């Protein structure tokens, strides 16, 4: 289950590596799309905590 | 005895360097 | 100002890696340069004392001690070319030191097998290696894949600390000239050397 969640965290991070700087460096897109990008930031941060929970429980 | 020649050549070389610096031809404009 | 300060720290951290075995323990970083050559002189002292050599009286080729000689301050030290590293205070050799340096009866009688092991891997993992990570001296053949981490840490940060001192020279020369206002070149209208005395 941890291996499934880290593989999801790698894919979300790879999507955010190539879309966050595009959204910040076109001069209007961040203020029109940051609710969508904060949603992906929270799924990213929540994935780290769920992995940290599953890693510590399994130890 | 050849160390007399070696010393004289080195001290003689440094004396040329002294005169080349402090007795140089001064560069002058016009 | 930071470039000068971080260059001084980089030279210091390099020599930490090369010399210190307290904050950089040799069980983790390998033996130091001084540590590995004392480990060699310790190994062949133990090798030859088992063969019945009285190692405190064994004369070398030059007339100094082959195994045990005396430092220029008077301490009983290891002989050979490792007399330069007589300030070495490794934790596997300090059990054999008295106030006079190495204790002769403790070398004759109580040398422990962990010390002979510790000096053996430190002799064979000396910080000597090539850029393609061939272990040993420059005349060694390609079988051992090893360069000490102490040699990687010291050489990289000595490289970096020099160039950051070059950065201190670049940026302090420039900031001093940009503040005075002639970093873009000499003013043709009022050149400073022209309004000076003839120089002779």
């Amino acid at each position: 289950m941890i291996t499934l969640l880290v593989a999801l965290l790698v894919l979300i991070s790879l999507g955010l590596v190539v879309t966050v700087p595009v959204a910040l460096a076109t001069p209007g897109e961040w203020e029109i799309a940051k609710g969508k990008f904060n949603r992906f930031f929270q799924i990213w941060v929540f994935l780290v905590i769920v992995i940290a929970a599953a890693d510590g429980i399994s130890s | 005895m050849e160390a007399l020649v070696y010393t004289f050549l080195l001290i003689g070389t440094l004396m040329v360097i002294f005169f080349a610096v402090f007795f140089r031809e001064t560069p002058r404009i016009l | 100002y930071s470039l000068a300060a971080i260059s001084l720290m980089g030279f210091t951290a390099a020599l930490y890696s090369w010399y210190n075995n307290t904050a950089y323990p040799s069980e983790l970083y390998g033996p130091t340069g001084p540590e590995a050559s004392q480990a060699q002189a310790f190994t062949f002292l133990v090798r030859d004392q088992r063969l019945g050599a009285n190692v405190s009286s064994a004369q070398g080729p030059t007339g100094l001690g082959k195994y045990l000689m005396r430092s220029p301050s008077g301490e009983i030290i290891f002989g050979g070319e490792t007399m330069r590293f007589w300030d070495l205070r490794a934790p596997w050799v300090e059990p054999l030191r008295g106030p006079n340096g190495l204790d002769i009866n403790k070398i004759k009688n109580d040398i422990q097998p962990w010390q002979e092991r510790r000096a053996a891997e430190y002799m064979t993992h000396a910080p000597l290696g090539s850029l393609n990570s061939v272990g040993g001296v420059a005349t060694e053949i390609n079988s051992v894949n090893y360069v000490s981490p102490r040699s990687w840490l010291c050489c990289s940060h000595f490289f970096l600390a020099f160039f950051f001192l070059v950065g201190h020279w670049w940026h302090s020369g420039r900031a001093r000239a940009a503040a005075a206002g002639f970093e873009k070149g000499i003013n043709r209208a009022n050149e400073p050397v022209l309004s000076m005395r003839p120089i002779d």
Binding site: - | - | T124, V144, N145
Partner: protein
């Protein structure tokens, strides 16, 4: 050019002979260089150069160490050159594998390959194995 004839090494004290498979040769060089090569590079011994790994010095040990089985017996149980006291506490061995953690994951097939590399190397490089810096 590694035929069966060069890969044919003496396996025991009676003089019987075996062929090393190409897996034994490749894995035996890898394991010897990792486990034993820091002290035994090129067949010399760095920490006691009187006792090398050349086949003449292996011939003159009192348990004669010119075999795969006799070399494997040394790795499981090392003695002096005349075989009179054990040196397991100062040599890496299965007998002192609690002391040496490098010997802790080593099968008897791995010791066979390491003993294979010590036996095969003089057949390839004759005077270079155990010859030191003169033949570098």
């Amino acid at each position: 050019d590694l035929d069966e004839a060069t890969r044919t090494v003496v396996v025991d004290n009676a003089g019987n002979t075996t062929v090393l498979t190409p897996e034994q040769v490749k894995r035996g060089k890898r394991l010897f260089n990792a486990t034993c090569g820091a002290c035994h590079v090129g067949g010399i011994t760095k920490t006691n150069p009187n006792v090398g790994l050349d086949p003449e010095a292996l011939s003159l040990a009192t348990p004669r160490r010119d075999n795969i089985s006799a070399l494997v017996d040394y790795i499981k149980n090392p003695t002096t050159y005349d075989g009179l006291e054990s040196i397991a506490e100062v040599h890496p061995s299965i007998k002192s594998a609690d002391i040496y953690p490098r010997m802790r994951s080593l099968t008897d097939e791995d010791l066979y390959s390491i003993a294979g590399h010590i036996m095969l190397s003089p057949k390839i490089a004759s005077e270079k194995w155990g010859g030191g810096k003169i033949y570098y």
